[PDB]
């Protein structure tokens, strides 16, 4: 039990100077301070000063303890036992000191110690805390519950784990009791503690569920913010876990939450507003809320107004917090919009008229925000009003207030689809014009919005942008020489998208001369170790695909570096996997973007890439990439494989027997994108192998057939599954034809909804081949085939004839009148397609 008078005065004076106004004495004394951390006796002084030295002032005492806390955050593995126990002993004995600063300091010590040493190393803590909970003195009980809150906040799953037993069996009923304590501060702690176990649906709470709801309900109208706040969090969380026990009280909950969404306390308001988001997700919502709508919308729409503090912090990275009342309200509107569709328009429209034109800009802004927020869910019933609203918004892009120009960009972008479905001179042309001006706006936030809006518009406009390319590139490349860094991400996006939308139309010497110099500038000046390459190479993978042979001037150095990036990454992984202590783990993103650039490189160049592939280790590398533990890396490698298979199969063919085992084991639909690119690859390969695919059919086909009949499977994955089955059937009809029955339905349903293209052509040659081989595969579901055949606008002649031989085949097989009875199912446009295009 050592104080030591020599060492005592040495630290007391070193604590003094660590409170000095100037940094010169501060930073040198802090250096000279925790460098005394070498001694195993040092941290004992610190607790002693905090708890046992009454002769010293509280600021000094408090600080000494906080330094001791910072000596557990870092340097706790090097803690001696007797020290640790003695600090633990002095804390629990003083957990509720009469001085609030000392009480709080001792508080956070207990919180950090019991955090760093998980909670096997203080098994005396929890039982002693629950004991100190029934304490006759307030300060002790307040101090205990306060540590119990932080502990619950830090180690919820650790307390629900087996690692310390299941002490929640007794703590849940214990906390619930203090819901009725007369102090507001205690009640707060109690609900906060219980709140930490709602989501994980902790069993200890689920048997006390009703008495939990009861206690909470009795606390709902508590006048103390913190309590109201914590009740709101609980009710909200409880919507996701125990919606059964909330349904009978639902209308009372919602009415309460409306009273709470406009709470006089900002925190409560925000926590209440969460309710509408969560509720919006439950399938019940659609009919439980209809009656509350004319009261909810105005509450949301008023919350979407910029809180005046936002105005000044907007107009370092000048940004508001991730999560606001405004944002939450806007989010809830967007989700409710998607739940009610047009049925929400009567509730909102009157408000829009009032807001959009309003003279105060803060109000106008929120109107434009609303207009964008409802855009997705309320689209079909918004269209009638759009020939007036768009030209209005286009004018607002010139409003003097920057934040108005901001959302106007966004809101227009949310109606981009409609805009392009119109004669371009009246809506698309002027929108584009003002957006281009705005991309170069003096305001950072406006550029961000304008550039994004333009990107959205480009996806929607496509080739309708071709005539305007000279102007577009001019401003995009200028922005390139101006845009800071955050905005550069968006700008790269806008260019890649440009290229994706216009494709080959970008391949003109005048456009290349504009677009390429600045990208090469960026290229040459960034180092291989620099993460600014990510958005660059990603951008280039789009530009290369679009430029096609216009890219030849640049292709070799580009191909050269991508292979290097892939090689330096794999190599770094093995020097890490065999020697973690010496070599650091590589960032796999370098490898991803390099694979991706290689992709768009094979796609833009086709057969011209072959010489670059022949004199490279790309295949050997790719084969390693396809085995990476990271799915995103497998994903990119399969896309590249599909591409090279198309570009230069002669260099891939030797590897097929090696590749196919890997592709075959990556048809797990839990990994959507990996599965997708594997399936696409298997397809392209099969076209190149021809009859030689025969060995692999039994290895993949049934996986594909399971996937295509699997519910809740994304539509594009379904699409490539359909394509690849088709392509496997084209080359191995004998092997694939017998499954005809098992895939024809979703195959047709999937492929009837895609544009006529080469892959669609590829797949239908297959389905046709399999049909002439196994006609009985389609007999039972021939209607699906007819509808899929009809989904074609302009089929090639031979394909059109193949469709025709088969249709007449069955008509002339089943009979004259037999066809009529079967054709009576056809919707009008179908019955009339087959008769006009194929002669029934």
């Amino acid at each position: 039990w050592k104080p030591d008078e020599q060492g005592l005065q040495q630290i007391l004076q070193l604590l003094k100077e660590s409170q000095s106004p100037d940094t010169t004495i501060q930073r040198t004394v802090q250096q000279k301070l925790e460098q005394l951390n070498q001694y195993p006796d040092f941290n004992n002084y610190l607790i002693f000063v905090l708890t046992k030295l009454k002769s010293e002032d509280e600021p000094t005492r408090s600080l000494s303890g906080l330094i001791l806390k910072n000596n557990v955050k870092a340097h706790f593995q090097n803690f001696p036992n007797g020290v640790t126990d003695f600090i633990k002993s002095e804390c629990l004995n003083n957990i509720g000191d009469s001085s609030p600063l000392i009480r709080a300091t001792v508080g956070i010590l207990i919180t950090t110690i019991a955090s760093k040493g998980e909670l096997q190393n203080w098994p005396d803590l929890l039982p002693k805390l629950c004991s100190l909970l029934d304490s006759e003195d307030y300060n002790t009980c307040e101090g205990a519950f306060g540590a119990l809150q932080k502990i619950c906040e830090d180690s919820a799953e650790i307390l629900d784990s087996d690692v310390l037993d299941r002490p929640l069996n007794i703590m849940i009923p214990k906390f619930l009791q203090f819901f009725k304590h007369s102090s507001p501060k205690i009640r707060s702690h109690a609900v906060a503690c219980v709140n930490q176990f709602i989501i994980s649906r902790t069993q200890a709470l689920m048997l006390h569920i009703d008495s939990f709801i009861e206690n909470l309900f009795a606390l709902a109208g508590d006048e103390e913010p913190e309590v109201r706040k914590n009740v709101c969090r609980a009710l909200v969380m409880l919507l996701e876990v125990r919606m059964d026990r909330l349904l009978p009280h639902m209308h009372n909950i919602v009415e309460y939450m409306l009273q709470r969404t406009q709470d006089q306390d900002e925190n409560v308001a925000l926590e209440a507003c969460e309710f509408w988001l969560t509720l919006a997700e439950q399938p019940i919502c659609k009919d439980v809320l209809v009656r509350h709508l004319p009261k909810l919308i105005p509450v949301l729409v008023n919350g979407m107004k910029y809180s005046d503090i936002d105005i000044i912090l907007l107009k370092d990275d000048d940004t508001i917090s991730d999560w606001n009342l405004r944002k939450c309200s806007a989010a809830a509107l967007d989700v409710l919009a998607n739940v009610y569709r047009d049925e929400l328009l009567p509730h909102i429209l009157p408000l829009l008229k009032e807001l959009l034109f309003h003279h105060e800009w803060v109000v106008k802004e929120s109107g434009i925000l609303v207009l964008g927020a409802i855009a997705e869910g309320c689209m079909q019933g918004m269209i009638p009003y759009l020939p007036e609203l768009i030209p209005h918004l286009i004018q607002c892009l010139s409003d003097k207030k920057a934040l108005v120009r901001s959302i106007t960009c966004w809101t227009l972008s949310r109606y981009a689809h409609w805009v392009v479905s119109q004669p371009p001179d009246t809506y698309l042309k002027p929108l584009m014009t003002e957006l281009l001006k705005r991309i170069l706006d003096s305001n950072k936030r406006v550029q961000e919005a304008a550039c994004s809006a333009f990107a959205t518009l480009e996806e929607e406009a496509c080739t309708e942008l071709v005539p305007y390319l000279a102007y577009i590139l001019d401003t995009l490349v200028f922005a390139f020489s101006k845009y800071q860094h955050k905005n550069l991400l968006i700008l790269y996006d806008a260019i890649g998208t440009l290229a994706d939308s216009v494709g080959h139309h970008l391949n003109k010497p005048e456009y290349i001369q504009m677009l390429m110099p600045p990208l090469i500038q960026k290229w040459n000046m960034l180092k291989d170790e620099d993460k600014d390459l990510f958005p660059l190479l990603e951008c280039l993978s789009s530009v290369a695909t679009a430029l096609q042979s216009g890219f030849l001037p640049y292709c070799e150095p580009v191909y050269q570096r991508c292979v290097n990036l892939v090689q330096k990454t794999l190599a770094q992984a093995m020097l890490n996997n065999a020697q973690p202590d010496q070599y650091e783990a590589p960032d796999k993103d370098f490898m991803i973007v390099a694979l991706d650039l290689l992709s768009g490189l094979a796609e833009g160049l086709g057969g011209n890439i072959e010489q670059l592939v022949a004199r490279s280790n790309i295949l050997t590398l790719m084969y390693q990439c396809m085995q990476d533990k990271m799915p995103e890396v497998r994903q990119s490698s399969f896309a590249l494989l599909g591409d090279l298979t198309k570009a230069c199969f002669q260099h891939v063919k030797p590897c097929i027997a090696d590749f196919m085992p890997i592709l075959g084991t990556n048809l797990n639909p839990e990994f959507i994108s990996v599965c997708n690119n594997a399936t696409w690859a298997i397809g392209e390969i099969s076209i190149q192998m021809g009859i030689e695919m025969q060995p692999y059919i039994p290895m993949v086909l049934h996986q594909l057939v399971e996937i295509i009949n699997r519910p809740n499977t994304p539509k594009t994955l379904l699409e490539n599954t359909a394509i690849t089955i088709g392509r496997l059937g084209y080359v191995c009809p004998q092997e694939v034809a017998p499954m005809l029955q098992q895939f024809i339905r979703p195959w047709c349903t999937s492929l009837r909804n895609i544009r006529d293209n080469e892959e669609k052509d590829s797949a239908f040659r297959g389905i046709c081949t399999m049909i002439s081989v196994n006609p009985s595969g389609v007999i039972q579901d021939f209607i699906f085939f007819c509808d899929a055949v009809a989904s074609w606008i302009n089929p090639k002649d031979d394909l059109r004839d193949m469709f025709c031989k088969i249709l007449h085949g069955f008509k002339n097989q089943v009979g004259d009148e037999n066809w009529r009875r079967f054709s009576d199912q056809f919707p009008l446009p179908l019955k009339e397609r087959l008769a006009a295009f194929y002669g029934v």
């Binding site: 967007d334 989700v335 959302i407 966004w410 809006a453 990107a455 991400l489 968006i490 996006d493």
Partner: peptide, 12 residues
């Protein structure tokens, strides 16, 4: 994949 501007997000 997020990079484009949004005044709010549906999934925070």
């Amino acid at each position: 994949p997020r990079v484009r501007y949004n005044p709010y997000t549906t999934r925070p």
